[PDB]
């Protein structure tokens, strides 16, 4: 079963996902639609090709032609932001599903709020120095994080991590945090993050220097 | 009626795998089916197997040689082994079984992270992030394998909470951090601890995040 990989459209406009099969399996047999929300198990949404469970809006509907099926779901809102996936019935009566669709929800652009966090005196003391940088509830995903070091381009020493489109605004955040020993971390002074993205006019950068702070 | 599955979150390759799933509300004999479904990380859902209403057993082709389910009555469970694990077979795992009709939703278990690795179980160290918005959090660092779980104030505090994906270091350890957005006015008189979970290694933490003493 073949379904693309991703869907999207704005707030309150209509989505469909298509499941493509054989004549051996959605040909034959039913089929069944679920929601796979972040961290969640699936939620069937429809069974046997266009009913739904109890508890199931009709927002969601499902349809079935020859070899392929049809999701589809209207009214879309943030809570909609899923991975949704289709599944039947193999030759041998076995269960088999689709690859699965993201479904993204289109809203108007965000522009990152950016927090910086020295390493704590805590953690220095364990001989290293994660340095990390906050962008907070934006859209787009796209965003680029650039690390400077007493104006040195980092490359290579810092990782991302990105959330899923929030369950109440549909935005993202992503928190990048840079690695060093903590003797390079006590090398230098000006530690900086600079963001650059659509809903800002130019690039926003936070920085603070080695020494302005004490734990608490 | 509620389905829990348990085991092991790391297994050695070659070795077994053993998950049992709990089943609460509902009678073990009395179900249409019971079965289990995987999902690697970023993937899609694999169908393993299932155990019939007779006892009667039906598995994957591709995985018929290494896996057993069977039910125990007694205990009202019933369980997966999946023996000769590869890193191929990490994956979420899910019990999930029909009860009541035909087309009742099937209920499904919260799905249980197995990671097969031959690198050993590290508990993580936990380090404040610490601060009209304020941002703080907690970076959870260099722990194996996946997951840790992360609340805020025991579970009140969610809103603007933001808890990101694990990054795997280039060392082979995981490192998360979770975040939290508050009114600024609020960090003189609000107690904030983030409550960490590393289940693998049976580390808890409860780590109180208090502003830094800082002169910029």
């Known amino acids: 079963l073949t379904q693309p990989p991703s869907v999207s459209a704005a707030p309150g406009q209509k989505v469909t996902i298509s499941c493509s099969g054989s004549?051996?399996?959605?040909?034959?047999?039913?089929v069944s639609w679920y929601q796979q929300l972040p961290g969640t198990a699936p939620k069937r949404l429809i069974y046997?090709?266009?009913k739904r469970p109890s508890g199931i809006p009709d927002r969601f509907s499902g349809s079935k032609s020859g070899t392929s099926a049809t999701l589809g779901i209207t009214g879309l809102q943030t809570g909609d932001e899923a991975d949704y996936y289709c599944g039947t019935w193999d030759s041998s009566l076995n269960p088999v599903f689709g690859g699965g669709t993201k479904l993204e929800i289109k809203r108007t652009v965000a522009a990152p709020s950016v927090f910086i966090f020295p390493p704590s005196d805590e953690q220095l003391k364990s001989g290293t120095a994660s340095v990390v940088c906050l962008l907070n509830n934006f859209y787009p995903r796209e965003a680029k994080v650039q690390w400077k070091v007493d104006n040195a381009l980092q490359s290579g020493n810092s990782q991302e991590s990105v959330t899923e489109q929030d369950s109440k605004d549909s935005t993202y955040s992503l928190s990048s945090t840079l690695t060093l020993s903590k003797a390079d971390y006590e090398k230098h002074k000006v530690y900086a993050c600079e963001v650059t993205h659509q809903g800002l006019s130019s690039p926003v950068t936070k920085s603070f220097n080695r020494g302005e702070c004490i734990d608490a | 009626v509620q389905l829990q599955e348990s085991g092991p979150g790391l297994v050695k390759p070659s070795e077994t795998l053993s998950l049992t799933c709990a089943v609460s509300?509902?009678?073990?004999?009395?179900?249409?089916?019971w079965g289990w479904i995987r999902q690697p990380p970023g993937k899609g859902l694999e169908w393993i197997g299932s155990?019939?209403?007779?006892?009667?057993?039906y598995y994957n082709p591709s995985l018929k040689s290494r896996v057993t389910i069977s039910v125990d009555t007694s205990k009202n469970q019933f369980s997966l082994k999946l023996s000769s694990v590869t890193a191929a077979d990490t994956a979420v795992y899910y019990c999930?079984?029909?009860?009541?009709?035909?087309?009742?939703?099937?209920?499904w278990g919260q799905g249980t992270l197995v990671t097969v690795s031959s690198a050993s179980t590290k508990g993580p160290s936990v380090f404040p992030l610490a601060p009209g918005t304020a941002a703080l959090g907690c970076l959870v660092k260099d722990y194996f394998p996946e997951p840790v779980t992360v609340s805020w104030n025991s579970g009140a505090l969610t809103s603007g909470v933001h808890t990101f994906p694990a990054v795997l270091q280039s060392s082979g350890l995981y490192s998360l951090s979770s975040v939290v957005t508050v009114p600024s006015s609020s960090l003189g008189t609000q107690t904030y601890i983030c409550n960490v979970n590393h289940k693998p290694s049976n580390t808890k933490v409860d780590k109180k995040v208090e502003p830094k003493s800082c002169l910029a």
């Open positions: 509300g509902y009678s073990i004999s009395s179900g249409y089916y």
């Open positions: 046997d090709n266009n």
């Open positions: 004549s051996s399996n959605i040909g034959n047999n039913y």
């Open positions: 999930a079984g029909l009860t009541q009709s035909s087309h009742n939703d099937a209920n």
């Open positions: 155990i019939y209403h007779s006892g009667s057993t």
